[PDB]
Amino acid sequence: TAATTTIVTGYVQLNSPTAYSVSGTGTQASQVFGNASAAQKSSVASVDI
């Protein structure tokens, strides 16, 4: 019995210096960014280079 999930799709993590905000009707946004609502800061001191 073969499986169902076969379309492997990676992450589309983009970048923005300024402040953005992502919203979407129904599941259109969650399927791409999940619970993500506006933005982050990334607070770069923890570079862990």
Binding site: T18, A19, S21, S23, S37, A38, A39
Partner: protein, 49 residues
């Protein structure tokens, strides 16, 4: 902000801003500073808070 953010809008005269993801004062501050082009109202958050 108890479990979420304040996804609201701001009507600056004729045009209307469509900001989202407000959890702290800094969030709203950066959102205003970014959209400063469209919205004809300057923002000024002193680093005090």
């Amino acid at each position: 902000v108890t479990g979420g953010s304040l996804n609201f809008d701001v009507t600056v005269g004729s045009n209307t801003v469509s900001l989202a993801g407000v959890t702290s004062t800094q969030d709203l501050a950066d959102q205003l500073n970014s959209n400063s082009s469209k919205l004809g109202i300057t923002a000024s958050i002193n680093d005090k808070g």
